Curated annotation (Swiss-Prot), chain B:
This is Uncharacterized protein YslB. Pfam families: DUF2507 (PF10702). The gene is yslB. Gene3D superfamilies: Trafficking protein particle complex subunit 3 (3.30.1380.20). InterPro entries: DUF2507 (IPR019642), NO_sig/Golgi_transp_ligand-bd (IPR024096).
Length: 153, 146
């Protein structure tokens, strides 16, 4: 895996959204965009495109350490991310919440490639000695499990 | 396109009372989404608005403001009703932040939604036109039919 992972600057707009964390909206409005409008426009390519959008997003919103993942996920409305395993070359998280529960109940196969790509890219941005990573998104009854593991280069 | 929701699409109604902050919303709608729809973001979003309208039908245009508010699209006001036309203004804190920092804010989803709702109402060809007015901190959406 020969690639130098590095972050890049946010635009003025991208930086400005931090100031909107205190403005209240609702999860219906959120799903309307993320889980209706987007899949409607992207169709069969939605999964691969979200994966790479997750990596692209990581580059704009780089974090400094693994411990920061849960807070980012929660604030981003991606759900509650709990660590089940944290080993030298493997991370496993549970991800859940009312929006996710509704997806698991009513969608054939919910997609979490945005989240998977984001974590994979963050891990690489933080450590230039990481070669390639592999991600798994496993559906359970009331939650999903995100697993990212990797080799050293 | 289609006027029937999937079971999941119908289910998001019971998320209307679940909280979500505006940062999370803008992260998906104004950062992730445009990066997946580059140059021709506008045609896609216009179509998507129509596609949405067909499965979220509204009986009258007087219902547009409530729909916009709940959908987090902003505060929509009808400001005129000239011959074969309706003019709306769209504004609010999230929109203001877009107008302040974005080179070319885009409201084609909203425009397509209004166009198709009207077309389904009167069975005549309708289209919507957008004008961002930074100096008045608002967007004007005008829908015309023939």
């Amino acid at each position: 895996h020969h690639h130098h992972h590095h972050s890049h600057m946010k635009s003025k707009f991208e930086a400005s959204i931090d100031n909107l964390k205190e403005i209240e909206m609702n999860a219906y409005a959120y799903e309307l965009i993320r889980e209706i409008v987007l899949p409607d426009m992207l169709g069969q390519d939605y999964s691969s495109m979200m994966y790479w959008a997750g990596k692209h997003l990581a580059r704009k919103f780089p974090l400094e350490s693994w411990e920061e993942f849960p807070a980012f996920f929660e604030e981003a409305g991606w759900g509650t991310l709990t660590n089940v395993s944290a080993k030298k070359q493997e991370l496993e998280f549970e991800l859940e919440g009312p929006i996710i529960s509704n997806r698991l109940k009513h969608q054939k196969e919910p997609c979490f490639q945005l989240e998977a790509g984001f974590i994979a890219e963050q891990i690489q941005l933080m450590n230039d000695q990481i070669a390639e990573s592999y991600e798994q998104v496993k559906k359970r009854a009331d939650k999903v499990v995100l697993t990212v593991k990797w080799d050293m280069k």
